[PDB]
Ligand binder design. Structure first.
Ligand SMILES: Cc1n[nH]c2c1[C@](c1cc(C#CCCCO)cc(CO)c1)(C(C)C)C(C#N)=C(N)O2
Ligand SMILES: Cc1n[nH]c2c1[C@](c1cc(C#CCCCO)cc(CO)c1)(C(C)C)C(C#N)=C(N)O2
Ligand SMILES: Cc1ncc(COP(=O)(O)O)c(CN[C@@H](CO)C(=O)O)c1O
Ligand SMILES: Cc1ncc(COP(=O)(O)O)c(CN[C@@H](CO)C(=O)O)c1O
Lengths: 410, 411
């Protein structure tokens, strides 16, 4: 009805609904939120200005909005065991901005994971506030094993004497050893920040070591393996840092929080407290390992580091005569969505790349089991091996159609 | 329903907030009621899409239709305001202002901006905010007697401090802002000009406030105040070199993935603002505000800062009544009238006690209040603040509030 007033906009949204139904979303950072999360974001909480924190707002009328924000704070403390939580960051980027503000001064030396090795842009990129505002020195992975070499990180720390070490990654498929990062931080007098955005759901399910007891500050997004709305979060066990975090978020770098999004965070956090969430997260990892077993035994799809401990994998496609941008293009043509992704010691442009990144949280949410993940990896292999044999790309398109129809959305 | 039974804590709180919005007079000047369509866009499956980059230049695929949506927001914004370029990704007004500064000045540069007590925003140079921490802000205010901007003082300050940038725009300023004078003062000292129209954006879009876009190097705004859209920010410019710096500052500069369900809501609201009926709404906003200022000027104890309004809001110095702004806020909230305490020009109390309250009409106007209803609101406010404890009076106000909200239901 209101769609009559703006048919162009609602038409685009309908096509996007259909695109999400008909494609296999293998983007490691995406998911499908519940009906309840979307209803919270579609609520009248968008109308409320609520600057400040629960019980000490700068506006009238927040007495019931404060319940929502307290639910999100307290469910985060329950899920992750943090003594303090801040649920107002608009995004992972704002969450990391405020975490740095609470820990270091502009120009300070910070050790963070290199982008090609799998770090995030906010872990030290020169085109990002992180690299522009602080002096970042990168660590990476070993060139042969493609996992983090903790003794190399240790050497780097003692050489550079950073005020802060950042751990966490956008494209690292192996377990991060937070105990060792804390060990190294302590040796050089540095604080430790962990960005668990990608693994937060796995951490909540007890399937990846929990960084919260080790890190001075833990940041996260709410929309990856946690399966919540797009937004950020900051955790800490230190009451003094909690006060600095809160001031840094507001009035430091934000104004009004998005209380409708925060309600969706509260919704998603109770979903994650349900025993069914542990089974979901278990299935994410099983599906991912199943998929890595297929790629390991295929010709020309080299799995970075040869294994996965979590939800994602990086695939080196150099053996196939293509770069990551071309691989992403082939797979889109058959309704399989991935992203081109730099690989350790990447030699091509960050917009060409030698690889693609694949993750299983979204298809697992659709209901894929181990057998279905194997099928996806085989269609991916077939499409990249089909050096443009139209007959084969069309078989793959059919295999995708078969899978989406067996696992429709709500 | 089924998910409301899974989580009664959360859904019963939202239900109570729906009732509060129905039953209170929402007089907070920066609030509004978005349409059903805006809420449905924010509640859409667009929340599931990562779309880093810009339309047609994304960092990965899958963005065919997200690109249509965001280009609708960009194009309707350009149409609404007459700008050659728009960025609709900023998560908020604060992020919009962060990126605008990054496109205009370097850390440590001298910036002229409105003082907080005088009506400026925290991002206009407060030392507790990134703006005051990152740049050298020099504040201008209003005149103590007339409580309006003194443009020769701004000129004097600009000539004395040689700012790299002058910022114009306010959060609690009820009078017309002369953007031409600001453009002239900036040119005289060679400064750039940035205008934050967050509060007056809808009025500009309706032609009822002078338009800053032709005078400002960069114009920033929120989408959720008089523009009546979802919570978010936006940046406008006519300069292609600046537009590139703006886009780079927003992403990958200070943000990651945009909120595309919110950006859909921005597209929905921009088309609503392009409709001729938006001009009548915007006119009614100002006529309601002016009708309230008249009531407050007659009452002793509710002193209207500067004695008039040209836009949607007014600031009330309540000290003659023997209370501060915090007590007035709390008195009004206990009779179901929602305002915010607010510093006034030359504030002498703590910024958390304050001498005043701020009142605006966009929300009640959206509910359908006309001038005679705005008059009744102002009378109830006067009565509540003069009542001094008298519960008969306060309950009288409470009945008036329920009369007005029952006359003008939501949806
Ligand atoms: C976004 C993003 N944010 N954080 C990230 C990314 C990734 C990314 C970065 C860039 C870049 C660049 C230079 C700056 C632009 O001027 C290009 C691409 C694809 O073209 C992908 C993907 C999305 C995960 C990535 C990688 N590879 C890593 N590790 O982390
Ligand atoms: C938020 C906000 N952001 N921008 C703003 C505000 C206002 C505001 C600020 C503070 C503060 C502080 C630290 C001050 C340095 O010590 C306290 C209050 C009421 O308690 C209200 C209101 C909401 C409009 C305001 C005022 N008055 C101005 N003009 O603009
Ligand atoms: C570890 C980490 N920390 C922070 C962020 C940023 O979150 P934001 O997009 O909400 O700003 C990301 C985003 N990660 C995106 C790229 O932006 C991805 O596809 O992986 C992240 O991976
Ligand atoms: C002129 C201007 N520019 C920017 C902002 C910040 O927008 P944000 O709250 O979305 O971050 C505001 C917010 N205005 C709020 C105070 O934060 C208010 O109640 O008025 C603003 O008034």
């Amino acid at each position: 009805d209101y769609k009559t007033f703006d048919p162009d906009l609602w038409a685009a949204i309908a096509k996007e609904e259909e695109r999400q139904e008909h494609n296999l979303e293998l983007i490691a950072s995406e998911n499908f939120v519940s009906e309840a999360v979307m209803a919270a974001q579609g609520s009248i909480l968008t109308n409320k200005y609520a600057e400040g924190y629960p019980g000490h707002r700068y506006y009238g009328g927040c007495e019931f909005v404060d319940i929502v924000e307290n639910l999100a704070i307290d469910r985060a403390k329950e899920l992750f065991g943090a003594k303090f939580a801040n649920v107002q960051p608009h995004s992972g980027s704002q969450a990391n901005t405020a975490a740095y503000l609470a820990l270091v001064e502009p120009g300070d030396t910070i050790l963070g994971m290199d982008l090609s090795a799998g770090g995030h842009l906010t872990h030290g990129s020169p085109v990002n506030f992180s690299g522009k505002t602080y002096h970042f020195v990168a660590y990476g992975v070993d060139p042969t094993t493609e996992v983090i070499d903790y003794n190399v990180v240790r050497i780097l720390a003692r050489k550079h004497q950073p005020k802060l070490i950042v751990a966490g990654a956008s494209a690292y498929g192996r377990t991060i050893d937070f105990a060792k990062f804390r060990e190294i931080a302590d040796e050089v007098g540095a604080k430790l920040m962990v960005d668990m955005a990608h693994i937060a759901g796995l951490v909540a399910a007890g399937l990846h070591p929990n960084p919260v007891p080790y890190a001075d500050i833990t940041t996260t997004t709410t929309h990856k393996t946690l399966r919540g709305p797009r937004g950020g979060m900051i955790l800490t066990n230190d009451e003094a840092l909690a006060k600095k975090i809160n001031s840094a978020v507001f009035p430091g770098i934000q104004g009004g929080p998005l209380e409708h999004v925060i309600a969706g965070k509260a919704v998603a956090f109770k979903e994650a407290l349900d025993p069914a969430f542990k089974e979901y997260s278990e299935q994410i990892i099983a599906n991912a390992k199943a998929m890595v077993k297929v790629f390991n035994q295929a010709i020309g799809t080299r799995v970075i580091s040869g294994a996965t401990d979590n939800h994602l994998m990086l695939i080196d496609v150099r053996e196939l005569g293509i770069n990551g941008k071309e691989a992403e293009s082939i797979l889109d043509s058959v309704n399989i969505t991935v992203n081109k992704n730099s690989i350790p010691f990447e030699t091509l442009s960050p917009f060409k790349t030698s690889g693609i990144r694949i993750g299983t949280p979204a298809i697992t949410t659709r209901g894929f089991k181990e057998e279905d993940a194997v099928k996806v990896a085989e269609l991916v292999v077939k499409a990249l091996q089909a050096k443009d044999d139209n007959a084969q790309l069309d078989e793959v398109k059919t295999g995708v159609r078969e899978l989406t129809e067996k696992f429709p959305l709500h």
